[PDB]
């Protein structure tokens, strides 16, 4: 599909058996999800943006389906206000910017 | 151009007569540049990101040339971690997400 940017580019994703709305975010290196109790091992991480840093839990090799396009990779879970699909998964679904 | 996302989508912009590097950021409503001087009146504003809220200066109707494409719109100036081109100007240059 083509998604214009008049509004926030929110799409449906599925992770850990939950459907969620997430921002397709070219400015995000990593994927950051709102607090959710995922099973598995994780590693602590700090990530920075506007306002400073938040603490997140890094989970690896997590399957994520984004608008019916399958992906699998690292997901960071923490107190973000919005679910953010970052470049680590955007590349996997063949997402590009075009103008 | 078509820009893939295995690297950060950084591009050269021209603003207030100066060249800068900025990140094409579909996850940002608004364009936010690191501290700099711009001519004209600005209004104090606050914006929030993943780490909390910051104070910015809002400049309206500012010409910005982005990777050769002209935009004229709102530019926020303040302590962002990197220069970001948000949807307000990405729409002006006809930028879309595609997959
Ligand atoms: C440094 C560039 C940029 C500021 C990084 N951020 C991505 C932005 O697209 C970020 C995404 C976001 C959206 C809503 C609420 C919080 C955050 N946007 C952002 O800060 O915009 C400022 C405000 C908030 C939303 C908006 O439209 N304007 S991020 O902080 O969310 C982020 C995401 C993934 C990530 N991975 C490693 S560091 C890292 C940082």
UniProtKB/TrEMBL annotation, chains A, B:
Ranges where the Peptidase A2 domain occurs: 20-89
Biological processes, Gene Ontology terms: establishment of integrated proviral latency; proteolysis; viral genome integration into host DNA
Domain of life: Viruses
GO MF term (any one): DNA binding
Keywords assigned: Aspartyl protease, DNA integration, DNA-binding, Endonuclease, Host endosome, Hydrolase, Metal-binding, Nuclease, Nucleotidyltransferase, Protease, RNA-directed DNA polymerase, Transferase, Viral genome integration, Virus entry into host cell, Zinc, Zinc-finger
GO CC annotations, alphabetized: host multivesicular body; virion membrane
Location within or outside the cell: Host endosome, Host multivesicular body; Virion membrane
Similarity field: Belongs to the retroviral Pol polyprotein family.
Record-given protein name: Pol polyprotein
Organism of origin: Human immunodeficiency virus type 1
Gene expressing this chain: pol
Part of the whole protein covered: 1 to 99 of 400
